[PDB]
């Protein structure tokens, strides 16, 4: 169905221990394809997907150029933000930026995003209209003012509505066997006694792609979402994902419980039962 391209940028100040650390990563859906680390030897944007390795020198030179320009602007930002929040020079601080675009199953533009965080909290974010800003505190209002006077929203709309979607289309085609795939989950439920009178029931989904999945437990048809332990979707390391959900139930009641699995690669939602 739908696809996205997203770039993620993290800068961390490290006072007395060097210039800030800067890491950038690009994803198509749940597939990483590029990275930059300011502390690596190469000082180059590097491939992280086989299908991106096709791109030629103009590409890598261009992407190294732009990524370093992102890094030097975040380095400035760290200094600026200290000023805006009257913080000390001695503390370590974090800036995060993410931007990208989503397209539907017809590869037409759905929406674009460009959001920024300081110390793990929303700071400023481009609204869905791609023409206005949501500033989450007074400092961020200063940023809004400067970005409005500088017509930054208009520059980002152009990239997000055009370039972003064009390259995302290019990548989806070039990486089509990797990127235009669905791997349905392989499912099963495990049962282990925790004592004389209780059992843990764990519903597993394995080897799936993309990562979006819903796992839910029902007791006699009723969702058990309050008593369900749901782990974060995790990478297997091979391009697929894993997830599980668990409830601890009274021994003898297993047959009341069913696990329900929802994923794009399932022809229909699955119900696993203990009978």
């Amino acid at each position: 169905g739908s696809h996205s391209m997203r770039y993620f940028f993290t800068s961390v100040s490290r006072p007395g221990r060097g210039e800030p650390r800067f890491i950038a990563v690009g994803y198509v859906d749940d597939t990483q394809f590029v990275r930059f680390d300011s502390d690596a030897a190469s000082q180059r944007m590097e491939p992280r997907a086989p299908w991106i390795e096709q791109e030629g020198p103009e590409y890598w030179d261009g992407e190294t150029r732009k990524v370093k320009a992102h890094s030097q602007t975040h380095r400035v930002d760290l200094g600026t933000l200290r000023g805006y929040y009257n913080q000390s020079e001695a503390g370590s601080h974090t800036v995060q930026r993410m931007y990208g675009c989503d397209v539907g199953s017809d590869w037409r533009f759905l929406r674009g995003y460009h959001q920024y965080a300081y110390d793990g909290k929303d700071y400023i974010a481009l609204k869905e209209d791609l023409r206005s800003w949501t500033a989450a505190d007074m400092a961020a209002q200063t940023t809004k003012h400067k970005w409005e006077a500088a017509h930054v929203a208009e520059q980002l709309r152009a990239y997000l509505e055009g370039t972003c979607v064009e390259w995302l289309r290019r990548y989806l085609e070039n990486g089509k066997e990797t990127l235009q795939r669905t791997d349905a989950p392989k499912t099963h439920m495990t049962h282990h006694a925790v004592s004389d009178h209780e059992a843990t029931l764990r519903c597993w989904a394995l080897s799936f792609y993309p990562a979006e999945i819903t796992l839910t437990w029902q007791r006699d048809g009723e969702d058990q979402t309050q008593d369900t332990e749901l782990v974060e979707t995790r990478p297997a390391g091979d391009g697929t994902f894993q997830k599980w959900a668990a409830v601890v139930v009274p021994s003898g009641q297993e047959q009341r419980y069913t696990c329900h699995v929802q994923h794009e690669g399932l022809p229909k939602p699955l119900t696993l039962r203990w009978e």
């Binding site: 320009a69 600026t80 933000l81 920024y116 700071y123 940023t143 980002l156 152009a158 990239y159 972003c164």
Partner: peptide, 10 residues
């Protein structure tokens, strides 16, 4: 591709 325009200092 990364953005070439619109990435501004705060």
């Amino acid at each position: 591709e990364l953005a070439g325009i619109g990435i501004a200092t705060v």
